[PDB]
């Protein structure tokens, strides 16, 4: 049934069900909930641990990214979703200061599809942050031929897109995106980008970026997942699987 981000089952750890535990997907806009009430039902030693961490809304993301265990990261993500709602949903308001980071990553790195016809709608959308309304409508034919049949030329732009998205969804989202880059399974990105589109409908540039990510994900190519040989630094195991509840 529904996933519980406080205690997550071993079968449930996948990019999709983890994607369901992201902070913005919790649909909490307002009225922050204090940490002791968030963790209220959980082991006592765990509660004392979280109090000893002295989480704040600013650095909770750093705690998520530094942790080595995915269940704990999801827990901190849920604590962020209940504790810091304005921070979580700020990115969706157009030209809010949360957008500056992924916009800057867009300007800093140019797609390989943009070295041919730099005036393509998307290339202007990442370059100048203008004409972002519909990126996948304009020149889609040309991009469709460019990306189709080429694994490498597609993986390059996909990776850069994955970095910008790392800056769009901090915390859990970031780590999931990292998983993509390492596992080279790029279709799982749907679960991240899909949920991002309905919240972002007000933001024009974000909506355009997400529509294009939808487009380049729909490219016609066959790429092989490369799960890690170590089996470590992956979601399944090892090692510890904390369950708070």
């Amino acid at each position: 049934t529904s996933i519980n981000c406080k205690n997550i089952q071993s079968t449930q750890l996948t990019i999709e069900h983890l994607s369901k535990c992201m902070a913005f997907y919790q649909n909490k806009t307002s009225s922050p909930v204090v940490i002791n009430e968030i963790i209220s039902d959980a082991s006592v030693d765990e509660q004392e641990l979280i109090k000893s961490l002295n989480l704040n809304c600013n650095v909770i993301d750093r705690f998520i990214s530094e942790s080595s265990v995915i269940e704990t990261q999801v827990y901190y993500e849920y604590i962020k979703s209940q504790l810091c709602p304005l921070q979580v949903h700020d990115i969706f308001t157009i030209n809010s200061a949360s957008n500056i980071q992924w916009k800057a990553l867009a300007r800093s790195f140019t797609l390989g599809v943009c070295n041919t016809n730099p005036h393509k709608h998307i290339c202007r959308c990442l370059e100048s942050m203008q004409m972002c309304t519909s990126t996948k409508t304009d020149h889609a034919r040309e991009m469709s031929i460019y990306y189709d049949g080429h694994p490498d030329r597609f993986e390059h732009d996909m990776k850069i897109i994955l970095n910008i998205m790392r800056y769009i969804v901090p915390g859990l989202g970031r780590v999931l995106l990292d998983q993509i880059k390492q596992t080279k399974d790029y279709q799982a990105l749907r679960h991240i980008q899909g949920k991002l589109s309905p919240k972002s409908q007000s933001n024009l540039q974000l909506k355009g970026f997400l529509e294009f990510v939808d487009f380049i994900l729909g490219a016609n190519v066959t790429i092989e997942k490369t799960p890690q040989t170590l089996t470590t630094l992956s979601l399944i195991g090892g090692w510890s699987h904390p369950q708070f509840e």
């Epitope: 204090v34 979280i50 002295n54 704040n56 600013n58 504790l83 304005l86 700020d90 200061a97």
Partner: antibody, heavy 121, light 108 residues
Framework: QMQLQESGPGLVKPSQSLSLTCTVT?????????WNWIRQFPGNKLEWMGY???????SYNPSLKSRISITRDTSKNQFFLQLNSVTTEDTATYYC???????????????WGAGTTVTVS | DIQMTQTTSSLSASLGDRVTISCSAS??????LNWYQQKPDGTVKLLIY???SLHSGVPSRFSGSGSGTDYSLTISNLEPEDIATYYC?????????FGGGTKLEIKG
């Protein structure tokens, strides 16, 4: 249901320390939050002086960082401000408040003292 | 460090009016802001925390708003107990700073 009060001398003329005692009634400083001293200068200008945490961590405004000291007594459940090398600029109304850490209650200044006006020269 | 500026130092309005007080920030605070009321006798009590949220016990007439570097406090209908000096605070990062303050007065 807690309340705080500041107990302090009326004035000290310059080159001396000014010390105040914030007594916290109805709460345990050990248990949680951050305990702060905040002075309002004449003309209604507010300045955050510094705080001591529930665990004893100290953070001071870098403007005052040299001469300011904030201690606490867990026994009588008090915490003390000492601002040394006072000048005529330090004349002001000094409060002591509680900044909540995000654990038991959100981040803000919750309970405030009535304030004690201490003067220089 | 982070300088908070209240554009209006003092303001007068009649009772029952709708008063708005503006708080500007030197840089982006990312929503971390508080609103305090210092009455004439000197008692200071928290009005608004986290920029939207209204503290427990504060009357329904007060509403916070704003985002980014710009923030607003709104008293919907002005009652005589509200006459006082108002302050805004950024907890973004230390050292914490306060606005210049806005004193309310009666027309009346």
């Amino acid at each position: 249901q807690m309340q705080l009060q500041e107990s302090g001398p009326g004035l000290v003329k310059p080159s001396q320390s000014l010390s105040l005692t914030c007594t916290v009634t109805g709460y345990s400083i050990t248990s949680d939050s951050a305990w702060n001293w905040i002075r309002q200068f004449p003309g209604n200008k507010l300045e955050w002086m510094g705080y001591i945490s529930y665990s004893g961590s100290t953070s001071y405004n870098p403007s005052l960082k040299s001469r300011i000291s904030i201690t606490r007594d867990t026994s009588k459940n008090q915490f003390f401000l000492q601002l040394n090398s006072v000048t005529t600029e330090d004349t002001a109304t000094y409060y002591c408040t509680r900044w909540g850490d995000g654990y038991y209650l959100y981040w803000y200044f919750d309970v405030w003292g009535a304030g004690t006006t201490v003067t220089v020269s | 460090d982070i300088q908070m500026t209240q554009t209006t130092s003092s303001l007068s309005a009649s009772l029952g009016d709708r008063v708005t007080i503006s708080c500007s920030a030197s840089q982006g605070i990312s929503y971390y802001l508080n609103w305090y009321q210092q009455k004439p006798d000197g008692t200071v009590k928290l009005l608004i925390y986290y920029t939207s949220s209204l503290h427990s016990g504060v009357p329904s007439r007060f509403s916070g708003s704003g985002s980014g570097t710009d923030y607003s406090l709104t008293i919907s209908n002005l009652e005589p107990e509200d006459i006082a000096t108002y302050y805004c605070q950024q907890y973004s990062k230390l050292p914490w700073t306060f606005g210049g303050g806005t004193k309310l007065e009666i027309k009346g």
